[PDB]
Write an enzyme that holds these catalytic residues in place. Structure first.
Site, short mmCIF file in Angstrom:
data_model
loop_
_atom_site.label_atom_id
_atom_site.label_comp_id
_atom_site.label_asym_id
_atom_site.label_seq_id
_atom_site.Cartn_x
_atom_site.Cartn_y
_atom_site.Cartn_z
N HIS A 16 -14.71 -11.36 39.63
CA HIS A 16 -14.90 -10.22 40.51
C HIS A 16 -16.21 -9.51 40.15
CE1 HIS A 16 -10.50 -9.54 42.05
NE2 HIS A 16 -10.92 -10.79 42.22
N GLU B 277 -16.80 -6.39 39.29
CA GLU B 277 -16.72 -5.52 38.12
C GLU B 277 -16.72 -6.34 36.82
OE1 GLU B 277 -15.27 -5.54 40.97
OE2 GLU B 277 -13.92 -3.83 41.25
N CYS C 14 -9.53 -3.69 41.24
CA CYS C 14 -8.19 -4.26 41.22
C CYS C 14 -7.58 -4.10 39.82
CB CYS C 14 -8.25 -5.72 41.66
SG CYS C 14 -8.77 -6.86 40.38
N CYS D 77 -9.67 -5.90 37.15
CA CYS D 77 -10.94 -5.24 36.90
C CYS D 77 -10.75 -3.89 36.22
CB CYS D 77 -11.71 -5.07 38.20
SG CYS D 77 -12.37 -6.61 38.81
#
Ligand SMILES: Nc1nc2c(ccn2[C@@H]2O[C@H](CO)[C@@H](O)[C@H]2O)c(=O)[nH]1
Ligand SMILES: Nc1nc2c(ccn2[C@@H]2O[C@H](CO)[C@@H](O)[C@H]2O)c(=O)[nH]1
Ligand SMILES: [Zn+2]
Ligand SMILES: [Zn+2]
EC number: 3.5.4.15
Lengths: 157, 157
Positions: free
Chosen positions: B52, B54, B82, B85
């Site tokens: 992801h 992040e 999420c 993350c």
């Protein structure tokens, strides 16, 4: 099958903390009795706080299988996955999780009080339907002893 | 200064979508007013569901600063991080998170209902002390518009 791969994860934890790659955590990803990835925590080796054992195993297994979902695979963790790792397991679509020691066993030697609500079923927003098995018996006792055993070989992070 | 870095994270989201690296998500990590990392979702590029925006930014910032903790840095995410993350943000010790769009804006165009209890303040086993800012006004408008502008410009994951 569960005992063999859980013990493999525990041996990964010992090997990783012994060679200084990271903390005493291991993870093994298996595809219908075939080991896809066998890894341990690499936070120190990689200078990467996200390089927990489970995340490293997911990365390796996805790279090997050339797919971003592992829905045909299962993951064995020596210790209860943290919130980051449980989120990674969710995103990876792994179909089953077996873990050896409860997070309290790691907390007892100074690790962060950092537990996944979705794993324990205590969330409002995050839920899980993933099949989760907390190991019992011999393998569980061996997995729990990892933290008291390796307290001296590394320093918390 | 918050608007500038949030807009850069949104720009990263658009970039990543345009080149097929991943979904419409970006993240920028800054030390005071100097960008340490500027990243977007790399799940498709890396064949890595953990990549992801992040997590990618955290890995790159930790590499840039030669350390596994970013206690002097802040992170800007185009979309609400999420659970994976947010766990990574906790582990990295980032001192502030600013995010643009609520997770519902991403769910409304095909992403999973996958929300971090610890970010929204409903966690029981995971508690964050991190300073969290949800963007308002123009920043929120830009971040929310990301998902309407990139609909069916990328492959869902
Ligand atoms: N399972 C598993 N746990 C890990 C790590 C690394 C750290 N930790 C810590 O363990 C505590 C509770 O799990 C939390 O403080 C976590 O940060 C890992 O690689 N695998
Ligand atoms: N912030 C952020 N979110 C991302 C991604 C990638 C997917 N997603 C999904 O977006 C929804 C809401 O978070 C969840 O279903 C997530 O799985 C990212 O790279 N950055
Ligand atoms: Zn973890
Ligand atoms: Zn995420």
């Amino acid at each position: 099958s569960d005992h063999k791969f859980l013990t493999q994860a525990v041996e990964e934890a010992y090997k990783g903390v012994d060679c200084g790659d990271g903390g005493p955590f291991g993870a093994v990803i298996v595809h219908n009795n075939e080991v896809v990835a066998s890894c341990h925590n690499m936070v120190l080796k990689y200078t990467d706080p996200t390089a927990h054992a489970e995340v490293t195993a997911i990365r390796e297994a996805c790279k090997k299988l050339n797919k971003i979902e592992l829905s045909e695979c299962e993951i064995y963790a020596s210790c209860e996955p943290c919130p980051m790792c449980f989120g990674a397991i969710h995103l990876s679509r792994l179909k089953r999780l077996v873990y050896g020691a409860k997070a309290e066993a790691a907390i007892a030697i100074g690790f962060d009080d950092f537990i996944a609500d979705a794993l324990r079923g205590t969330g409002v927003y995050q839920k899980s339907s993933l099949e989760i098995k907390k190991a019992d018996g011999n393998g569980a006792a061996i997995a729990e002893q990892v933290f008291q055993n390796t307290k001296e070989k590394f320093r918390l992070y």
